Design a protein around this ligand. Structure first.
Ligand SMILES: NC(=O)c1ccc[n+]([C@@H]2O[C@H](COP(=O)([O-])OP(=O)(O)OC[C@H]3O[C@@H](n4cnc5c(N)ncnc54)[C@H](O)[C@@H]3O)[C@@H](O)[C@H]2O)c1
Ligand SMILES: NC(=O)c1ccc[n+]([C@@H]2O[C@H](COP(=O)([O-])OP(=O)(O)OC[C@H]3O[C@@H](n4cnc5c(N)ncnc54)[C@H](O)[C@@H]3O)[C@@H](O)[C@H]2O)c1
Ligand SMILES: NC(=O)c1ccc[n+]([C@@H]2O[C@H](COP(=O)([O-])OP(=O)(O)OC[C@H]3O[C@@H](n4cnc5c(N)ncnc54)[C@H](O)[C@@H]3O)[C@@H](O)[C@H]2O)c1
Ligand SMILES: NC(=O)c1ccc[n+]([C@@H]2O[C@H](COP(=O)([O-])OP(=O)(O)OC[C@H]3O[C@@H](n4cnc5c(N)ncnc54)[C@H](O)[C@@H]3O)[C@@H](O)[C@H]2O)c1
Lengths: 336, 336, 336, 336
């Protein structure tokens, strides 16, 4: 299965890295081509050198129209409109990993199907008229039939395993989320006009706490249908370049203790959902490959009379945790 | 009323600034002397130049044993033990603003009473065997009798006005707090041994999200006695040098909407408790003089069936909001 | 003289602030209109709230097509092509302050002359076929005849007064500059494709030391003709959001001591060229109104045998120092 | 050869990491014991988790009096006075790697010789009454006779290979250095009293450009005796947590071009002195094992008439480059 990566951004590049570094374990798939808005020279440089995830342990260079890794060539295009990228005919692209941020719906990502690609996995929420898959939570809903699929967001991936565990073990009546989240490239380096015009998005990212909207909690029903309508929340964007944490405050159907909550959630531990009691901080999270890293040291159950609130917290490398999830889904997708 | 400032740190210096810049409005009080562990040369320099709060708009210099502001001299001591600072006899100190972080209890801050000072206001939580005052919430509990008093923490000051309003308007059954908080000098510049040995406190402060304990919510009953035992919470320390935000998630006794919550809390607006709907971010908070700045744009009420959670959020300049509160209490304290 | 500001970016907004806050002293000029690529709502918000320069001490709001300051209306356009902005006919614009970064040459900035504006002052180097003015150094070259003029760069303004003083007092044989410089909006928040494709410009700005090209030293002859061909240098972009410092290493025509150098440069002190011996750091520089702030504490003259190198260093608020210079030139320009 | 590490700080921990990760290549040496001011629990945690250098790929834990790596125990002491650490009798310590920053002279580091250790290598400049070794430049001066030896500073290690190459190839008449340098734990997290009382050291480190003194250039004659008295310079401390760059501006004895300079310096390439033309930035430098990484892309030779200045620039991971150098010297020291 021949993969075209649309948008060699943070996610597109890390997906390239993860696929290659899985080696044997990613045999069914291989990246064959890439599309962006820039030179092969720059794409190769950014794959090689990463300010947050370190230097790629391979030999990378460019030609006039490709990047080269360990001797193998990967074609690079600069086609702003997806139906125009000729990588099916040129490169045998079967499958698009859509990571530009500009095709986040079924309608839009049809452009790749017009281009002759067979399947698209979108690196973002892309609406409710397709499936959203969080690997480890509802990847068994995925079939070979599916043409265009969403991998959700980083926050979706951080949240779904934790709420899945809580729902199955205790039941969630209602809940509200705050994710303390790294800055991303939708934000501004310094205060100035920002695409979309949001007064907070416009503010210098690496010197402010900036409240942000997020639909991750609100849309959780696409992944965990039982919690439809039960959750909401928001984000605070803070000055780290990567590394994020999701807090959830729930009313559960049963009276619990922190220890009982921790014990129940540990039952769900997996490559997708880690359990980490080592008193870590955000920079230790970088490079972790689970989609969500539950932190039992932050669990807090607050009780007065018959009323009880349950706070549970999971870390995530918003870039790399998400990427590794996408790759898990990609590998399953391929095995179909 | 002659004030000695013990600990010319962030709080001690800003209190000096605020008192001076109130001018006429701080007539009953004047700083006469200062104690720390360092040279007058350095104390004067740090009063003048501040990386977060800008340059003090006065002429500052030092002698061999004092700082000088606009021509007036303020004696500087370097006495590690408070009962040894001779500023009562030397300088007529009546009253200590205790801001070292090293005398945060009644027993310890008795050292100043041994030194011959009459009253102490402590710039921090100092236990339950004295009063903790949040100006605008329970300063009417304060009498002339009181000898050693706590001004609570920055977080206490951020939280109490918001919960006071909620308790009086709707009633709080239970609640849990997360404050997304600037780094402070208890933290480390780079990973290394930290006083107290905490594995998270030890981590580089300006490059990590770092979970932190805080008793602000748990101890709120000292300020708002009705909420005794009803609240808990924690902190996330993030890479801003000042500027913090407190989120509270409550179960209230009544069903509310966000708009109803916002409207009710606005009734409590005061110099101590601001209401700011302008879509600000943390750097806009710097220099604000309220103890707590309610942000109605972040209000979120999440409902499923008969169950409802209410999230309310207030900003605070952890350094300067707190300082201005302390000064309000100080001015009232003096008017007694 | 009616001013249109093209590009309400960092420079355009700060120029608006500086003009207003000069009050009486900016009587000959007034901003009447603004052009950018965004909503009045956002422009008003960003004028009011600034992450680095604090909140503007005025009442700011927007209508559907203007910003409003203290009751007065300023028309806002969103015209990507300058010959299309109708602010001459609509608003009586006489004069354009060109601050978009997209018209940095005589040819391009003719677009405003086609639009019917009489004069342009460009907030950047714009070639050698017009005058470049550093106020305090060669503003006496400016006449009423001039139609399109350059105010140089921030670095030009930091460098020219220092080299002017050195050239007139000792003579410069040759010199090389390094400016340690705040990040700017030409850089990336996180590693990714950057306009122009530069492999270093592409790197995350707030987490790297990033070498950068600059022609400030090389082109100094446009401002100080005697030093034509004598200087070169570069920049290191570092993680501060504003605040910069220029080091120059010279061979001079005479043997000097640090003290002699400091004494000679102090003779040139002016509103444009400050002299500051208070051991400041970059955050103290923010808001300073001189174009260049000489720091005698950093002067170092290194001698072996008959050979001598002279290092001199000046701070600058790259945003605000430059802006205040531009405004000085603007006020002189108007007085013609 | 049994090594005690005094001061399990950034350098002490990274040296532990480097020794272990050399495996076979560090056979002659092994760390047996550690001394600091803190709990084994914390030391183990900080060895395992590093905010800048990532997670150590080993199993780390503590007992009540030791750290444990991959099953092997390393004794931990908390002895403030070095002559009191009993690790010779207890642990067979032969050799001290002195990394506390508190024993940086021959006299002081004699304390370990009183404790019964045979040799000390000090992780810092420690005066002129012993040898200072920069591996790759003058490690052939080292003998078995030497008891207490200095490994210089990070900056010394960055500078010496570059000046060695220049001196041998062209001759240096005079030169001046500026190192743009990461913040270190001598600095303050926020403005406040700093050990030693320096007005600049006192300033918040992660939000300022801060000029700093350094004797690296001035003392270079201890390593490259020919350049005695020929060099000086200083530092600018900037907000990165690690990763530094040294610029040198020289008058050379011969007229050169940039290309000739680059070509000559490349002749000196070694494990200790790297040559890197890939347009890197500071975060790419982290983890590099050379003491100095020459960057030919920054070379600039500026000529007017018969006068010429030569700017050459080398990167260094101030923590890890230095550490790997120390370990090279340690391995040679042991082979004696
Ligand atoms: N960064 C995160 O933490 C994260 C986590 C989960 C999901 N996501 C989602 O992943 C997507 C990309 O995120 P990112 O952080 O990689 O963004 P990015 O800005 O780093 O990358 C976007 C890339 O797409 C390229 N591009 C833009 N428009 C294009 C077009 N028309 N055709 C081809 N290439 C185009 C850009 O040049 C850029 O290289 C977004 O949908 C984002 O919401 C991001
Ligand atoms: N920084 C905040 O946001 C904030 C907010 C509210 C409350 N507080 C509390 O205020 C107190 C001080 O905080 P800070 O941020 O000003 O700390 P800081 O480190 O900036 O200042 C502490 C000052 O006390 C001096 N000092 C230490 N020990 C001393 C002693 N024995 N005698 C005299 N001086 C001594 C130190 O030299 C330093 O200048 C602490 O209790 C802190 O918890 C801080
Ligand atoms: N920031 C500094 O330190 C500094 C110092 C001296 C000189 N300069 C120069 O000043 C100019 C602007 O710098 P900045 O920091 O203000 O940039 P900025 O990105 O903050 O502002 C640029 C503004 O121009 C607007 N704009 C872009 N294209 C436009 C167009 N076609 N028509 C109208 N508006 C348009 C953008 O929307 C933005 O608001 C550049 O030439 C820069 O080199 C900057
Ligand atoms: N960090 C760098 O980039 C770097 C580079 C080259 C040289 N150095 C030098 O290395 C030495 C240490 O630097 P660092 O960055 O590791 O400092 P650090 O603060 O990270 O470590 C110092 C360690 O020594 C411990 N310590 C302090 N006093 C002690 C005592 N009396 N007995 C035992 N342990 C004690 C401290 O608890 C701390 O863990 C200093 O001399 C520094 O100048 C540092």
């Amino acid at each position: 299965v021949r993969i075209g990566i649309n948008g060699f951004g943070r996610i597109g590049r890390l997906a390239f890295r993860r696929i290659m570094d899985l080696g044997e374990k990613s045999s069914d798939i291989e990246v064959v081509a890439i599309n962006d808005l820039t030179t092969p020279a720059l794409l190769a440089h950014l794959l090689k050198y990463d300010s947050t995830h370190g230097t790629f342990n391979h030999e990378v260079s460019a030609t006039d129209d490709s990047i080269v890794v360990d001797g193998k060539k990967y074609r690079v295009y600069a086609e702003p409109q997806a139906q125009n990228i000729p990588w099916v005919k040129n490169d045998g692209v079967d499958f698009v990993l859509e990571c530009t941020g500009f095709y986040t719906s079924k309608a839009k990502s049809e452009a790749h199907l017009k281009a002759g690609a067979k399947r698209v996995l979108i690196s973002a929420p892309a609406g409710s008229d397709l499936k959203t898959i969080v690997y480890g939570v509802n990847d068994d809903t995925l079939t070979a039939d599916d043409k265009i699929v969403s991998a959700g967001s980083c926050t979706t991936n951080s949240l779904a395993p934790m709420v899945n565990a809580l729902q199955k073990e205790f039941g969630i009546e209602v809940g509200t989320m705050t994710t303390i989240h790294a800055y991303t490239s939708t934000q501004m380096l310094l205060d100035g006009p920002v695409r979309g015009g949001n007064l907070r998005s416009a503010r210098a990212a690496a010197i402010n706490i900036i409240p942000h909207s997020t639909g991750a909690a609100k849309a959780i029903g696409l992944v965990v249908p039982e919690l439809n309508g039960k959750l909401n929340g928001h984000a605070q964007r803070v000055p780290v370049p990567d590394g994020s944490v999701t807090e959830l405050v729930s009313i559960l159907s049963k009276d619990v203790t922190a220890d009982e909550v921790n014990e129940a959630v540990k039952k769900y531990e997996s490559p997708s959902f880690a359990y980490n009691d080592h008193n870590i901080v955000s920079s230790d999270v970088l490079g972790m490959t689970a989609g969500s890293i539950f932190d039992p040291t932050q669990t807090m159950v607050t009780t007065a009379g018959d009323k009880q609130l349950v706070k549970t917290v999971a870390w995530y490398d918003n870039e790399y945790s998400f990427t590794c999830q996408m790759v898990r889904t990609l590998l399953k997708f391929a095995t179909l």
